[PDB]
Amino acid sequence: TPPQVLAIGFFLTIIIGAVLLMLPISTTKPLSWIDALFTAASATTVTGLAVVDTGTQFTVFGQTVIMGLIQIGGLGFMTFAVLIVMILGKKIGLKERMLVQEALNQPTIGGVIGLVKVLFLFSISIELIAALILSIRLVPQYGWSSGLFASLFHAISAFNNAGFSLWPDNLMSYVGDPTVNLVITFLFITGGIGFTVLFDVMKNRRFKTFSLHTKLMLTGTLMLNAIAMLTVFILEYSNPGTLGHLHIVDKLWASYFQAVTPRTAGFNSLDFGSMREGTIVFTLLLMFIGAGSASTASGIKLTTFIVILTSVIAYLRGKKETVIFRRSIKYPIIIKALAVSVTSLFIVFLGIFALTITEQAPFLQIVFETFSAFGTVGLTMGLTPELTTAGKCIIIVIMFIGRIGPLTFVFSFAKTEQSNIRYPDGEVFTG
Amino acid sequence: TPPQVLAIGFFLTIIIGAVLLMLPISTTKPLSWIDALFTAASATTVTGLAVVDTGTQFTVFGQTVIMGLIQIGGLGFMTFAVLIVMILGKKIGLKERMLVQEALNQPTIGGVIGLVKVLFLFSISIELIAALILSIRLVPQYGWSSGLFASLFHAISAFNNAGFSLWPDNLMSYVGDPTVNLVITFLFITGGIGFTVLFDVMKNRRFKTFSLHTKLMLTGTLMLNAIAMLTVFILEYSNPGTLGHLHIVDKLWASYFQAVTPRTAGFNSLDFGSMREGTIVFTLLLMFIGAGSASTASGIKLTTFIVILTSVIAYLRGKKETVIFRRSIKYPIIIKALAVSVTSLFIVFLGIFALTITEQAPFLQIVFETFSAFGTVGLTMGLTPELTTAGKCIIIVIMFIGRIGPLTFVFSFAKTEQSNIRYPDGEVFTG
Amino acid sequence: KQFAVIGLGRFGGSICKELHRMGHEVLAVDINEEKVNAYASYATHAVIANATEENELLSLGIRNFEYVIVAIGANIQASTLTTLLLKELDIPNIWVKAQNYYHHKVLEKIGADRIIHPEKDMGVKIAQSLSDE
Amino acid sequence: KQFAVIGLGRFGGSICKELHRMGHEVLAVDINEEKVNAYASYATHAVIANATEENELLSLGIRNFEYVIVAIGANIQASTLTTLLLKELDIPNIWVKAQNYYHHKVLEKIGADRIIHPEKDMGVKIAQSLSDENVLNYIDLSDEYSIVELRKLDSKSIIDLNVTILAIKHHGDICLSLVIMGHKKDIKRF
Amino acid sequence: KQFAVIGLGRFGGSICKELHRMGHEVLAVDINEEKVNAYASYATHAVIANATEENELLSLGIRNFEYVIVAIGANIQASTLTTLLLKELDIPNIWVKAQNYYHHKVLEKIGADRIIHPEKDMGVKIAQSLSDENVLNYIDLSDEYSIVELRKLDSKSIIDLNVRAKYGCTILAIKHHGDICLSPAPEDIIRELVIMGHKKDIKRFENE
Ligand SMILES: Nc1ncnc2c1ncn2[C@@H]1O[C@H](COP(=O)(O)OP(=O)(O)OP(=O)(O)O)[C@@H](O)[C@H]1O
Ligand SMILES: Nc1ncnc2c1ncn2[C@@H]1O[C@H](COP(=O)(O)OP(=O)(O)OP(=O)(O)O)[C@@H](O)[C@H]1O
Ligand SMILES: Nc1ncnc2c1ncn2[C@@H]1O[C@H](COP(=O)(O)OP(=O)(O)OP(=O)(O)O)[C@@H](O)[C@H]1O
Ligand SMILES: [K+]
Ligand SMILES: [K+]
Ligand code: NA
Ligand code: NA
C-alpha cells in the first residue's frame, strides 16, 4: 500500500487544485472543466504545459493556487504530510516512516525523517533568497505589487522545475539578461540535482568524501550540460528563427539556457517551434533523461541512464562487473534501472501512438509533446494549445505517470506474492 | 578475431557486388558509384531499399548478381565459406568451427557443422519448390524466359527476407492474389523464424519436445502477427489511400500481408506513404523487433524482446526470477538482451539524428527510413529515392550494422582484457 | 491422471521417467537444482522446491494431484513432514518411500496411504534367487 | 591433427602449452573456472565443462578430435567415467593419466588406448639418478640394453680406453661418431 | 608518495587508516570482499584481488607504488609468493609482516627490504612493562642505553636527588598533570618522568 498511498494522495491534489482554479475568484475568463483539470495537473505534476496563458486567464488568487500546487508537487505529497503531522504534535510511527522511505526512493529508513526536515527548510530558504535576488531586477519593470509577486512566482516555479511563467512570452524577453538567466538556471539545477545530493554536499565538503550517487550526479550533470550546450550552439548558430540574429554574448546565454532547461524545468528563451529538427531530436533524448533521483525533476533519472549505459559498455568490453568510480554496481541496481527505462519507453510509445490516432498534427510535434509531458518538462513546439479534449486527457495521464514514476504507478495496482520455488534453467538465443 | 572475420568478410562482399553492378553488362542506364554501392549493400544486407528500380535499371545479368548477393547475405558469409571448404576436401578445424559458432550465434560448438549442412540444403530445396509454385502463376503473365526468372528471383528474395521486386509496383498488383500472398509470406515467415527453430521442428515433431527457444519463436510469431493484423485492419479500414476502396476479401489479404512484411521482408501491397500515422507508429515497433535469432531476418530478435519484456514484468510483480514456459532465464541471457536492445536503440537514434542534419525531409519519413534500414526491412514512405549522397552513405552504414548485429560490430573493434579484480559495492538510486 | 513425484533419486527419478514414458502428466519436485535440471526433460513440470514448506507446496497446485509419491527415503524428517503436509492438504493418495521399520511406523501413524520399501523388497527377491540358483 | 586435453593440472596443462607451442589446435577442458582462464591463452579453445556429462561432452564437438587426453589422475570416478563416455563416442585414441595400479586396471578394462603414469615414471628415473650420481639421463632400449648419458677419464683419449661410445659433450659441443650404448650389466662395469 | 597495503587485517588495516588520515594515496588490496568493503572509505582505492596472481597484480598498476606493504602474517604461502612477485616486478621498497622465525628467514632470502614482527615486538615491550610496573614506555637507543618513561620521589626537588653524577642518567622531562617540561633545571618539585641513561644505571634509580 505505500505505493497506493502515493498514487491516491497525488491524484486527490489534482482534483482539489482543479476545483479551486475553476472558481470565479481564481479566474478572469470562463474556464472549461478540461482546461482547469489540465492546468491543475500541469501544476501538481510540475510540468508547465499551458493550454491557457497563466498571466491573463488567472487572477492573483488563481496564480497563488498555482504556486501552492507547484510547491506541493515539487516537494512531493508525503513531504508536507510529515510536516503537518509533526507540527500537530503527532510522532512519526514505523508505518508512516515507511511511507516516507517509499516516497523519497530511499533504500533504508535510516534518518529519513531528518531528511524531510532538511529538504523543506532548504527549499523555503533558497526560494526566498532567489526571490529577493529576482526582486531587485523585476521591481522597476512591474512596480511593487506585481514585481514582488512575479519574482516570488518564478522563484518557486524555477526551483521546483515547473516552467510556469506569468509573462506571455515565457522568458523570451530576458535572453541577454544575466540576472534572470543565472538565478533561474541555478534554481532548477539545484532543485533537480537531488535532495540527497544537496544534503551530502552540505555536511561533507570534499569531493572524495561524497557518496557514489553524489559523485555520479555532480559529474554527470556537468558533462551532460556541457555536451548539450555545444550541440545547441553549433546546430542553431545560423538558424534565423532562433540564435541567428543575436549577438555572440546573447548566443552563449541562449545556448546555455536551452541546454539545461530540458532537464526538466521547461523554461525557454528561444522558440522551439522554429528550431532545426537536429536540435529537437537531441532535446528528445535530453528530456527523456531527467535529473537527480529524489528531487523536483522527473523522467528517467541521470543515474538510471548512467547505470544502464555503463552496464552495456562493460558487457561490450568483456568485463564481468559494472564499475563506476571504482565501485561495483550490483544486479538489483541494474534490474531496477532496466525496469525504469523499459516501462518509461513503453509509456511514451503508447502516448505517441494514442496521440497520432486522436489528433491530426505533425509527427515531430506529437513526439516532442509526449516526451515533454512524460518528463514533466513542459517545452512545446506549438501543439498544446491545439490539443483536443481527448488529446488533453492523454497528456494528463502521461504527466501524472511521469511525475509519480512508472515503477510506483505499476506497484500501486500490481499485487506481489512471494514464491520460494525455482525453475530449471532454460536456454534462449538473444542475438 | 572471429567477430573481425565476420565484419571484414561481409564488407568485402559489398565491394565485390558493387563492382559487378557497376559494369556495363549488368546495367542498362549509367549508374553512379553511390547508387551501385547502395544497391549492393541493400542486397548483401538483404534490406531491399531501392534507390533505382531493379526491373529497369539492371539487366538480366545484373539481376542475377542481385540474386547472388541476396543469397550470400541471407544465409550469412560463413555458411558458404564452410561449404566451399568442405567441397574442396578440406576438413573443418577447431578454429574454423569457432567461426561458425560465432556466425550462427550458437552458445556451443556441438554439431554446428551439421547445422550448416542442414540449413543450406533446406534453403535451396524450399526456394526451388516455392519457385515452381510461383512459376505456374507467373508464366502466363510473362511467358517463359521472364516468367521463370521472375519466380526464381522472388522466391530467393522472399525466403531471404529481401523485399526486392522486379515489378515497378512492389507486389501492389497482387493484393487479392492468394497464390502470391500465401507463397511469399510463407517464404519469409519460415526464412526468418530461425534455422535452429526449423531444425528442431524437423526432428522433433511434438510441441512439448521443442526447446525453450523454439517454443518462444513459434508462440511469439503467432501472437505478434495476430496483434499486427488486427491493428492494421482496424486503423486502415476507412483510409481511402490504402485498404479503403477494396473488397473485404482483399482487405483481409492486404491487412495480413502488411502485418507480417515488417518482420523483416519489406514487401508491400499497400502504399505506406498514404497510411495513417497510427499504423506507421505501430510498424516502427514492429520492424524494430525482428524475427528468429539465427535466420535471414534482422533487428532485435523476437526472443530478445520477450526476454526483456518478461524480465521487466517479473520485476514489477516482485518475482526474483524471470520465468517463461516454466523455465528460468539466467542473468547472462538478460544482460546480453539488454546490450542488444540498448546498442540498437542508440544506433537508430544516431541515424535519425544524422539524417535530420543532412536532409530536409519530413520527420516521420526520416524515422521510418532509419528503422527500416536498421532492421533491414526495406519499407519506404518515399524518402529513399530523394536521399542525398551523404544521406545514402548514412543508410549504408545503418544497413551494414543492422545485418551484422550491433554486438558483433562492436566486438570487432573492441578489445577485451580479462581482469579478475573486483570492487566494493556502491549504492546509487535509479528511481 | 496427474501424478506428483517429490524427491528425484534413484527411486523417485525412475517413477518420473516411467510415468512420463507412458504418457502421463508428472510434476517432479526436488530441493536439489542439479536433479531438477536433469529431469526437466523427463517430466511435464519440474520445480526446485522444498516440500517441507506449506507455502511452496501450495505454490505448485499440489491439491490438483490425485497421487503424490514422496520418494525421500534417507531423510526421515523431510519424508515425514512432507506427508504430514500432504495429509493436511487432503491429498487422496500418498505413497511414501520408507527408510527402515521405525520410519514405516511413523508414516503409518501420520496417514501414509501406501508405504514402499524398494531396497528391502528387492533384497528379498535377490536373496531368494541366490539361495535357489 | 586436433587434440583435446581434459583436465588442466600440472600434467594436462603442460600438454596444452607444449602442443600449442608446436602449432596445433588444442581444446582445453576443465571443470574449474580459474584453470580455464589461466590456459585460455595457451589453447585454441578453452571451455569450462564437466567431462563426466555426455551432453556437455557433445556440446564441445568432441567427435571431431582424433586424440583426447584425459589428464585427471586424482579423481578415479571422474577419470573412468570420462573415458567410458569417450569410448562410447568412438574416439579413436584415448590417452588417460592413471592414479595407481587399480586405476590402471580399470582403464584397461574400459578401453583406454594408452595409460600414462607421469609421477611413477619420473620417480623411477629420478631414483636411478640418485643411486648413481654419474648417470644424468638414460633411455631403456630393452630390458638388458640401454643408452646412458654420463676424474679418471679426464685427459684420456678414446683409444686409451679399450672398452659403443655414442657421443661426448665438450662444453656445449657434441660429437657424432659422454653418451654410451651397451648392455645394462656392461654399462655398470664401465 | 603512493603506498600499497596488501592484506587488510588488524595490522594492515591499521596502516591504511593511519596513512589515509595523514593524507596519502593508499591502495588497499585484500582477497576477502567484506574486508575491502569495510576499508573502502579508508583508502584512496580498494580492490578485491588475489595478490599471489601476477595478472591481478599487474591489473592494479602495482609498479606505480614506491612502497608496498605485505600485511599477511598467518599465510606463509600467500605472504612469500606475493613478495616474490613484487620483487620480480622491481618494487623499490617491500615491507612484509612475518609470522615466525622460519617465515622471517624465507623472506630475507627472497628479498624483503624490511621484515616486521608486530605481535612479537609488542609482546617484548609489554613483558618489560609487566616486569617493572614503574616502566610505562621505553625506547631502546642501543643494547646498553635506553630512554625509559617512569612515593619516595614525591615532594622531592630535582637538586635533592644527585643521580645526575652518581647514577649517571639525565632527566629528559617530567610530566606535571598534562604539562611537559623541557630541559628541567634544578630545582623542580617532583609530584606523584623521562630519563635517559645506561640500561644498568636506569635499574639502579628504580631501586632508590
Ligand atoms: N525437502 C526435500 N524436498 C524435496 N526433495 C528433497 C527434499 N529432501 C531431499 N530431497 C531429494 O529427494 C531425493 C531422494 O532423497 P535421498 O537421496 O535422501 O533418498 P534415498 O533413499 O537415498 O533415495 P534413492 O534410493 O531413491 O536414491 C534426492 O534427490 C534429494 O535431493
Ligand atoms: N570432471 C572433471 N572434468 C574436467 N576437469 C576436471 C574434472 N575433475 C577434475 N578436473 C580437473 O582436472 C585437473 C587435474 O585433476 P587433479 O588435480 O585431480 O589431478 P592430479 O593427478 O592431481 O593432477 P596433476 O598431477 O596433473 O596436477 C584439475 O585442474 C581439475 O580441476
Ligand atoms: N592472497 C591474498 N591476497 C590478498 N589478501 C590476502 C591474501 N591472503 C590473505 N589475505 C588477507 O590478508 C589479511 C591478513 O591475513 P591474516 O588474517 O591471515 O593474517 P594475520 O597475521 O592473522 O593478520 P593480523 O594480525 O594483521 O590481523 C586478511 O584480511 C586476509 O583476508
Ligand atoms: K517542468
Ligand atoms: K528486407
Ligand atoms: Na601429481
Ligand atoms: Na595477529
Author numbering:
A (entry chain K), B (entry chain L): 15 to 445
C (entry chain H): 7 to 139
D (entry chain F): 7 to 156, 160 to 172, 179 to 192, 205 to 217
E (entry chain D): 7 to 156, 160 to 201, 205 to 220
Per the authors:
Mg2+-added and Mg2+-free ATP-BsKtrAB cryo-EM structures (Structure I and Structure II) are virtually identical with an r.m.s.d. of 0.30 Å over 2104 Cα atoms. A clear region of unassigned cryo-EM density between the two adjacent ATPs at the intra-dimer interface was observed in Structure I. To minimize the uncertain effects that Mg2+ may cause on the structure of BsKtrAB (Structure I), we hereafter used Mg2+-free ATP-BsKtrAB (Structure II) in comparison with ADP-BsKtrAB (Structure III) for the following structural analysis.
